Amino acid sequence: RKTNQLQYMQNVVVKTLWKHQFAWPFYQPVDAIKLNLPDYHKIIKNPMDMGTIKKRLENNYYWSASECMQDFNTMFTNCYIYNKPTDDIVLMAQALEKIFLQKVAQMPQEE
Numbered sequence: 001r002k003t004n005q006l007q008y009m010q011n012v013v014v015k016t017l018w019k020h021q022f023a024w025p026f027y028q029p030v031d032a033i034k035l036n037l038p039d040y041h042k043i044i045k046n047p048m049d050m051g052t053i054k055k056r057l058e059n060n061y062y063w064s065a066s067e068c069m070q071d072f073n074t075m076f077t078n079c080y081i082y083n084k085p086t087d088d089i090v091l092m093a094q095a096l097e098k099i100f101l102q103k104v105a106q107m108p109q110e111e
């Protein structure tokens with residue numbers, strides 16, 4: 001069984017974000033070839049995406065919830081590093097990130 005907090009990351013945070021209309025670009029690792037993203041892996045050192053986060057939760061990978069939160073922070077920040085303020089993907093990430101913050105502020109205590 002996962003920690004209370006990791007269950008919350010899976011059943012509240014990921015479940016909510018996955019269903020959001022803007023989440024789909026984040027469902028799998030950025031494929032820099034398919035997306036024609038020059039030098040993506042030269043500038044983004046630690047790729048992350050919500051499909052990987054969801055798999056890590058399903059597959060019992062994390063030891064504690066802060067590791068999962070760090071993966072979300074990496075995912076969002078990578079989007080901002082690579083893209084300029086007016087890009088649609090930045091607006092999409094910003095909406096998801098606000099929800100992420102609102103939800104992790106309500107993370108439960110372990111008991």
Ligand SMILES: Nc1ccc2n[nH]c(Br)c2c1
Nearest residue numbers: 025026030078079082089
């Ligand atoms: N980190 C990044 C940067 C640019 C992107 N375009 N589309 C997706 Br999904 C992206 C993710």
